[PDB]
Design a protein around this nucleic acid. Structure first.
Lengths: 50, 186, 102, 56
RNA sequence: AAUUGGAUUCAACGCCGGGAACCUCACCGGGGGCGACGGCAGGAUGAAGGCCAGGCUGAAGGUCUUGCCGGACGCGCCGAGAGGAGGUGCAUGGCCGCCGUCAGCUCGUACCGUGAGGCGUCCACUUAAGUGUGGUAACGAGCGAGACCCGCGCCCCCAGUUGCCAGUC
RNA sequence: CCGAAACCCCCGGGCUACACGCGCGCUACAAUGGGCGGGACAAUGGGACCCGACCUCGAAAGGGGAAGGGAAUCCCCUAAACCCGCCCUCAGUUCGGAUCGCGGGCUGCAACUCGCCCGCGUGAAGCUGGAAUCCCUAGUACCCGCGUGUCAUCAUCGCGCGGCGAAUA
């Protein structure tokens, strides 16, 4: 295992999501945002930034 | 495929089930398997000196034997039947498995030989042989040969008439090979 | 009516003839015209094998026979007169094929 | 560390290494392919239950 | 670099190999990697599994930099497993070669010998044979070998969709 | 006995390296011959990602199409030795086929190491073999092809079939 993985930011009475949501499949799958190159999370797909 | 191959397929089917069931049903006292093959549910007839072990200790073994039969074959509803062997002492393969347990147990050679000889001659054996190839508890490769009455003759209408049972009786110092050749009256 | 072929083979001699004879006896008397039980070949199968697991010295070599024999029977009866005759016990170990044409 | 599975993953499309028996579990040792894949050594032990006949 | 190993006079050398380009494969070179079940300390404060992209790899997120998902438990050792075509066939079971497809080995009762044993199973004749014959202080029996089983010549019965200008309007 | 290892996964290489020695075999030193053509003959067997009719293209290896066949009923399939006529006229050759250049097919991811075939060119040793030594006694040896196993592919092997058909005992 690999701690720490608290990367979701916090508002005062809300939450917000740091990372990007994929545009190939639907919402529910986050992007390992490299800055130019997007890995996929569910399975493992070579995606480029849109 | 054709006529020729299928018969051999069937006979190969006999071996894979007769090999496993022997090794398990040494507690029962294994003597055969009358295998009736159908498109409805493969009907195996397991031969034991004693049916009360094969069933199990409360249904477990008969269900266990129903359950491994589904894995090997493509008949997923195989029945189990237990028929007694009518003379297990006329059957040699029973006496081989029965002698193997006794040598596993540690009882002396000529003693463990005498009883055996005596129980099957009482049963009705024109003649009997027990051979025990093995270490014989030293480290020289010598067999001991226990001999009464008639024996296997010449040719092949020799081996068909007689019975022959083989069993590896395991030890923890080595091994001992258990051969038991019975000649029934005929 | 429907001309049926019973094509019946067996791996051993004693098992195949008893069924062929019994099939020609029970069918004889009812609504059946029956052509006789014809013997085709033995496709004797030779497996020719090396005995010794060393493959060493002289090794004596087993000849193997598997002999499979095929009797054939034409019959003129119904599909119901067919099952009546297919009642029979049959040796283990005896393949009985049925083609149906008019 | 971390790595993905292995149970062998190379070509074995055909040859002897393609085969194994249904009694002693070998590649190079004999595999009689008539729908009776065993080694020559097993074959001899098994046959009288098969119904093969020694006689020539 | 490794030319995997074993086999060694008959009885090791077309042998284990009835199938070595990878596979096989056990050898070598290089890259990468699982260790059960218990004890011990750790846990979800997010994977033990997956993954772009370079940087590296003969290739493999494999490895690092780097950023991250799906849903939820596993190192390090310590006993001790699974695995090993890793050693010992002078520790073995099985099977097999050769001596030997040879012609021997035993038991009963009797008999002889203080006894180990003998006799019989020896001798004569005869056969591939303790095979058979005669003799004989022996008479018989089992195994072996023999017949027994399978295959080959000739004929016949049952059965013919293989068989043919056989005989034929 | 081994325990990131004598495990495990992988690619590549090695077993097919050679100055040499031997064993078991194939092919062979020609007129009882070679080409070419024609004609008369078998048997065991094996055949579903398998045998492949037949038709077509390709010089061919093979490719395209496609019947039948899970089998006395279809396919591999042609036997080979034979004989008759024709050309050729005993030389290291029209023997013999090693070695090398090239063109080309076929299987597999892939045949340089290390496959086989087809065509053209290339065209090596060998012209009957010392000492020594092996096998066998009749449908056998001697001789000729034929199939199968294992099996994509390495068969001058192993098992098995029929054709010609003796010497000496």
């Amino acid at each position: 295992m690999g701690q720490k993985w608290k990367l979701y930011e916090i508002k005062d009475g809300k939450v917000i999501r740091k990372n990007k949501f994929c545009p190939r499949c639907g919402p529910g799958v986050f992007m390992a945002d490299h800055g130019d190159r997007w890995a996929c999370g569910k399975c493992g797909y070579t995606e480029w930034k849109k | 495929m054709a006529i020729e191959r299928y018969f051999i397929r069937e006979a190969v089917r006999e071996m894979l089930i007769d090999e496993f069931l022997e090794k398990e049903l040494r507690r029962a006292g294994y003597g055969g398997l009358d295998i009736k093959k159908t498109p409805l549910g493969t009907k195996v007839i397991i031969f034991a000196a004693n049916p009360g072990y094969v069933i199990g200790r409360g249904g477990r073994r008969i269900r266990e034997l129903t359950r491994i039969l589904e894995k090997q074959f493509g008949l997923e509803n195989p029945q189990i039947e237990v028929e007694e062997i009518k003379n297990p002492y006329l059957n040699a393969k029973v006496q081989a498995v029965r002698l193997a347990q006794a040598l596993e147990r540690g009882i002396h050679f000529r003693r463990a030989a005498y009883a055996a000889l005596r129980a099957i001659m009482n049963n009705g054996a024109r003649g009997v042989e027990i051979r025990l190839s093995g270490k014989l508890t030293g480290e020289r490769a010598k067999s001991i040969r226990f001999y009464q009455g008639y024996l296997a003759k010449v040719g092949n209408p020799a081996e068909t008439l007689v019975s022959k049972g083989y069993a590896q009786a395991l030890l923890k110092l080595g091994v001992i090979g258990v051969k038991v050749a019975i000649m029934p009256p005929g | 009516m429907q001309k049926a072929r019973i094509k019946i083979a067996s791996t051993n001699v004693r098992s195949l003839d008893e069924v062929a004879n019994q099939i020609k006896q029970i069918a004889e008397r009812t609504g059946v015209r029956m052509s006789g039980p014809i013997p085709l070949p033995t496709k004797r199968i030779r497996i020719t094998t090396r005995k010794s697991p060393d493959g060493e010295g002289s090794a004596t070599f087993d000849r193997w026979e598997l002999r499979v024999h095929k009797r054939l029977i034409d019959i003129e009866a119904d599909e119901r007169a067919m099952r009546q005759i297919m009642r029979i016990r049959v040796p283990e170990d005896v393949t009985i094929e049925i083609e149906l044409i008019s | 560390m971390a790595k993905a599975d292995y149970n062998k993953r190379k070509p074995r499309k055909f040859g002897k290494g393609a085969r194994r028996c249904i009694r002693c579990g070998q590649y190079g040792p004999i595999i009689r392919i008539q729908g009776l894949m065993l080694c020559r050594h097993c074959f001899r032990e098994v046959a009288p239950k098969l119904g093969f006949r020694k006689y020539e």
